[PDB]
Nucleic acid binder design. Sequence first.
RNA 1: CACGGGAAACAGCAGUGAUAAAAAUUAAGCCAUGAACGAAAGUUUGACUAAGUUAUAUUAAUUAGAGUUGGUAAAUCUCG
RNA 2: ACAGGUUUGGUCCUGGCCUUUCUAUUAAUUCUUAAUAAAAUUACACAUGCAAGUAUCCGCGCCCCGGUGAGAAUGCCCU
Lengths: 169, 117, 292, 77, 49, 190, 86, 55
Amino acid sequence: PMKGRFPIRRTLQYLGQGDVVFKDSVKVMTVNYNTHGELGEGARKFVFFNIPQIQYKNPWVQITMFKNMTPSPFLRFYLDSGEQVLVDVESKSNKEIVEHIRKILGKNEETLEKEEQEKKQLSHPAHFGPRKYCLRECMCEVEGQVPCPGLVPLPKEMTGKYKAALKAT
Amino acid sequence: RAYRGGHLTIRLALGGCTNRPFYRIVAAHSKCPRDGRFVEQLGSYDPLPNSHGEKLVALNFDRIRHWIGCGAHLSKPVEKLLGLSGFYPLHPMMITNAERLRRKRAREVLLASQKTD
Amino acid sequence: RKPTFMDEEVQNILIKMTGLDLQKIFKPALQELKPPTYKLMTQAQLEEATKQAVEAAKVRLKMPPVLEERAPINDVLAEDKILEGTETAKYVFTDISYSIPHRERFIVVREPSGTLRKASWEERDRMIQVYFPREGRRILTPVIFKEENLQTMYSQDQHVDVLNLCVAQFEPDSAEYIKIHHHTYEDIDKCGKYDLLRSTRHFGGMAWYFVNKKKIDGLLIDQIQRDLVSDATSLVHLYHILHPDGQSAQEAKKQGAEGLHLIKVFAKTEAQKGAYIELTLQAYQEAFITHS
Amino acid sequence: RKTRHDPPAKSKAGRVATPPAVDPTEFFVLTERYRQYRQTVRALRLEFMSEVRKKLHEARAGVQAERKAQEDAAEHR
Amino acid sequence: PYPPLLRAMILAQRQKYGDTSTEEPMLNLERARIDPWDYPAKLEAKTKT
Amino acid sequence: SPYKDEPWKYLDSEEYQNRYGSRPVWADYRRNHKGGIPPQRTRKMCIRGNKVAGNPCPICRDQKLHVDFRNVKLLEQFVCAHTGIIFHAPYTGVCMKQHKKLTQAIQKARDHGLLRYHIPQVEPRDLDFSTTHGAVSSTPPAPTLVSGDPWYPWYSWKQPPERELSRLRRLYQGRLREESGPPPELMPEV
Amino acid sequence: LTRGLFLGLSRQETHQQLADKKSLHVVEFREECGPLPIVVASPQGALRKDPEPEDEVPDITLDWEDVKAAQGMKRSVWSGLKRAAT
Amino acid sequence: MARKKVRPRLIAELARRVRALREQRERPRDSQRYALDYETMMRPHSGNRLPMRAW
RNA sequence: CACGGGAAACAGCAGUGAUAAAAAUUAAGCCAUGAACGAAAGUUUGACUAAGUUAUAUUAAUUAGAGUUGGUAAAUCUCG
RNA sequence: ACAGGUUUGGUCCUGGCCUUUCUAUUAAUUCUUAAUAAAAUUACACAUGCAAGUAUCCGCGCCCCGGUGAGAAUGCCCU
Ligand SMILES: [Mg+2]
Ligand SMILES: [Mg+2]
Ligand SMILES: [Mg+2]
Ligand SMILES: [Mg+2]
Ligand SMILES: [Mg+2]
Ligand SMILES: [Mg+2]
Ligand SMILES: [Mg+2]
Ligand SMILES: [Mg+2]
Ligand SMILES: [Mg+2]
Ligand SMILES: [Mg+2]
Ligand SMILES: [Mg+2]
Ligand SMILES: [Mg+2]
Ligand SMILES: [Mg+2]
Ligand SMILES: [Mg+2]
Ligand SMILES: [Mg+2]
Ligand SMILES: [Mg+2]
Ligand SMILES: [Mg+2]
Ligand SMILES: [Mg+2]
Ligand SMILES: [Zn+2]
Ligand SMILES: [Zn+2]
């Protein structure tokens, strides 16, 4: 990316390195902010930087902007049970907003490695099949077994045509 | 795809190579093809002896007993394989063809003894 | 209460024994290289990077466990004489799941005679490797662990790579691991190559084999030649810990000896060639007093 | 393979299947071996059914699951 | 008696949790009664409960 | 070749230093091809019978070169010093048969320890080292195992009642087959 | 091409000049050497005790060809071609 | 599934209706269904030949 | 769509016409896996297994022919 | 793309075409044997042979396997 004022925020590394993952009950995340005054600077930097990362880590959660209706910026969370979480920002900076959201409602770190742990249980090494899901295709490729007939030819005594010839004679 | 009926079956799926067969132990639907779409691959069975002279069998014990507990039917070779495993008792087809080999080989011994004279 | 390898005293003794050489522990390796990353750092950030490299070095020198030889498994679960001649080969049934630890898996062999028995340790580890791939293990026994190839690598002083292949290939309670490690420690004892394994995590293994095999002579000579004597009397204190009923330990308790007196007592008492240790310590003492 | 609406074969239209010869003692011991075989397999299969019921009932309403629910509710509050 | 390797898992699982008692586990067959083949099957539609 | 069983003697010889010098064997060889980009696959085999076809390979133009695991100085020229991988055949210029032979020779040399290559530091395989579990430790034997009897009473053969034999003969009359007695305990061999 | 190449390689900035103009240590972090802090140049003169200002989002000019190569979207058949010796 | 271009097929429902009506009207009686020819052991209605164990 | 009407259906395995630049055996068995049936020995299976034909593609050798020689782009002498 | 050839008496810039790399069918020339993988012109019409049977009758199965890409922007992913 050459175009844009900050071209680095449009890369896959920046979208993947933002670590805020909401709970499963979170549905709507709404930012009301202003474009004037030094008070809303942190909210404007939050909108300019982190909302792509949160939206990448939560693709099913709606995130909506509103500009210049309320004199103080705020964030509003709408849950599944009709629950409304208000986070008020007036002088908090961007990193403090990030830790504040991640501490109010995010996913715990231990829940993150356990979530990828039952994600990693699905790919068991002992299965066989295609390369895209499984590590091996033949049982031939295993070192101790019989080599594959497309690479190393089999002995004559194992071959079915020789078996048919000896049975018919 | 959608079928009119059928049941869940734990069976042997034939993949592999020409004159080098391979059976994957497969819990799948009955009406699907032998190498078609499956529910879960449980284990594997090597039909050929290795350099160590071993025929190598892998079973996924908790998933096999879960599928049998929720009602998966078993085919005759996988009941034979489980009977040799000892998770299930010995299959009476293995019992009877074992005694048939005893009778046939004893009759072959008697025939060889008569042909010696 | 016999001393074991995981005791805190012997662990801190081996940690201060192995030392810390950053350039030796961080060596440019032979995989596919990538362009390095540069940054501008202050001095305090430089000691911060150095110290996080220090705990990285400690978790790299997390030492492998050493155990005794395991007992063979000879247990037959069922005997069936009715299947004595139905099959020619033998069947191996292997428990596979992600949640069962590998020591607790069921690896069971049907013999061609019809016996349902437990598999032995070698075929058990082979089944663990076949139905669980991991890098560094070959399914068959490699040609590299033959004695001619070991002597080739040892003449090419590849001892750290031989030990790394041994711990990657075999299991520490196996017999092949024990005999390969013991032959390695015997050959480095004969050649005096202890400086190769200083900042290696496998230093504690040969120290433990030496303190159980009662051959501390050449290692003490090497340490006094490399001028590290606090760690040498730490080794003597390790010897006194592993041998509480030793006449060196009673002479030490009688005299109330310090470090250098402890080394002198060990050299006069239980060193096989104590004359060499005494002359080497005398040379070190006169050199250190002259130069300091 | 064939289909409902195709006619059968003319050669096999007048053909009826033949069961094989029976060895009576071997048949009787065989029939018994199926009876207590299917008995043992049925008992094992209802044992695995009870295991499936136990695991599913625990996965739905286990004491650990109420501790997780109470803890997440308390943390939310 | 159990099939032998399943009996081995029963012994291993009770030894893992510390059950010292060496009583032989027994598979019970009161629900395993199988009505033989010449019983006439029920051709009436079963009411789902 | 007069060398044969010792290929490293020609590597240590004066003629190798006179001809090739400190630079590798494949440094002075240039492959002729169709354009600005060489093909991904080289020539399959360069010598067919007694006939050498065209410009020979860097290995194959000097018949005193032997591709073996015994010489390390020849095999090092096809292995990168820093990266530590085998050079591909378009990089060097050898034929495909000798490239396969080179790959097998480097594999055998690394398996015999004559060539240095990267060995990563591997953690121990298991977390806890315990023999106490019944998978590896012996279980107490079965009451049917100590008695020497089969695991089930029906594993052996039992003589059926004569009324049941007569009932089966009545039901399968006309299609009957000759009965057999008890099976043998142990088979003899032919 | 020759004039631009020589201008670009003559406008090349060395690590000694970078350390002298920043008055800070420069550290080379090799990937094959692990987390070891190799110091390749040191600032002669007065060493500054003030750290660099750590920006959360750096302002750098990125090239779309380079980012496309990094993200693996360069599926051109000519990029991975095996060629001859140097 | 559901799309915006689905067209209202009527002939499939009508054919199922006529098929159900015709089987309900011409449901075979048990006498003509199960009458047996005693020499051929072949069913005139279903076309099936009896097994030899029931001969 | 399939009540009905055109009209007597191989988009099953083999094969035949027409057509197309496009060319597998009108073949052996259920011995092994799957499916169907039966309480079961078991029966069927042109799925499948074992083969037959084909440089279509890789490998091994038993094998030597094709393209090109102005530049890109390796490589030419004399005649018409 | 590590690029190259090509506009003009000639240079620079812009801008197309082609070559160099890999795979698959057909044709031409040539062709020795094996193993493995694959067989692919056609939703045009078919001579003939087989491809759903089992089972003490009832019953159970009978585009289930297998075949093809004609039609439909059809549809992929998710409740
Ligand atoms: Mg195949
Ligand atoms: Mg049809
Ligand atoms: Mg056809
Ligand atoms: Mg034709
Ligand atoms: Mg063709
Ligand atoms: Mg033809
Ligand atoms: Mg033809
Ligand atoms: Mg046939
Ligand atoms: Mg069959
Ligand atoms: Mg069969
Ligand atoms: Mg070809
Ligand atoms: Mg151009
Ligand atoms: Mg012009
Ligand atoms: Mg011109
Ligand atoms: Mg052709
Ligand atoms: Mg019927
Ligand atoms: Mg299809
Ligand atoms: Mg349309
Ligand atoms: Zn294979
Ligand atoms: Zn060559």
